[PDB]
Amino acid sequence: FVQPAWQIVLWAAAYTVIVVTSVVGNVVVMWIILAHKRMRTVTNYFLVNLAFANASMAAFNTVVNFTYAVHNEWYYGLFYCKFHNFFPIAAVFASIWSMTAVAFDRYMAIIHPLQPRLSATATKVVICVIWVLALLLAFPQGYYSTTETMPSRVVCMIEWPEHPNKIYEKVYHICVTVLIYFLPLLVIGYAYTVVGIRLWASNIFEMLRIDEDEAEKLFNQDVDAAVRGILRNAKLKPVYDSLDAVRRAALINMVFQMGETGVAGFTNSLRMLQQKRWDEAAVNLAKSRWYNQTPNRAKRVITTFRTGTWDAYHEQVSAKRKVVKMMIVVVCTFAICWLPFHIFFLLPYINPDLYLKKFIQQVYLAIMWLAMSSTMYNPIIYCCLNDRFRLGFKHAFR
């Protein structure tokens, strides 16, 4: 019942913001990658496909979806009725599976470096396939879309053939929802956790192999022997118990080098770590004879005590971590934007009367705004979290 003019203009402005920032932003992103030829990096080829799918959905559907929702009248005829119901499914499938292709490409480059799967022709055939499967999946929704002509208006409504309980319509809707939301997010979710652990995490075995032809060193049995010994030692047990897993590895690393007795000698530094005075302990340990004899190892161990991270046992400058952080954000943005949408359309099966009663028009206009805003965020994310992308946007200015 809430229908004031003060609100409609305020919403129309909120919706145009989407159409402009999505077209402007994604046309520039497509330009940055395609024109440079140095930028054509397989991951960026899928980002072009994602930028096209985004920009297309904003241009074709935003005006048409907003006007129908505001006036409850279909102005654009039977063809555009079929088209506005077909295109969003195809464009969302293409977007989320281009994101999955990027995730699979990173997973392959990071976890399986010896088996290459990146090829310019293959990337083109993947993008080609993604779109074929997207248009096929969207087809039944477009096929059953039609107009109904009435005395005061025209109505665009989707009508499936009459069946005892309309199973095919409900099965189709669930299948689309799984293919464009739940399933690819599970695949991307899997890929970036494994990749995330590889790029950011580490362990004592990884550590000891770096700090310590010839026979292979057996750390497995000695690490457990080193833990059993520290917990038997009165001078080392309170410190060790107080420490997080990362710092515990730094303390064990020291025991592997000097032994239980030699480590127990650093009484002051061990009390600093126990008191959680990291920088103080780091400063005192760099003054030791141990640091003098082996500065490179000691600097790595000290950094582990100072930061409480695996930073010393990973590369300093990595273009790999920059992309993975950027793409994790993009996917999390997608998952957020589409969740209320899918719940809104999933609910007519659980509680059919719950929607129609209240002022769901202001609810739907908020929910549809969120869903459609997923189309404009990606260029913004690229400028904030990537150097070469933000410099590319600056170059497109007169």
Ligand SMILES: C[C@@H](O[C@H]1OCCN(Cc2nc(=O)[nH][nH]2)[C@H]1c1ccc(F)cc1)c1cc(C(F)(F)F)cc(C(F)(F)F)c1
């Ligand atoms: C075309 C439209 O579809 C909805 O509105 C019509 C009925 N339809 C329920 C139904 N009736 C059937 O017969 N099948 N499904 C809805 C629906 C269909 C599939 C879904 F996965 C979710 C909702 C739609 C779909 C998406 C998408 F693709 F992202 F989902 C995004 C957007 C936009 F962002 F532009 F507003 C619009």
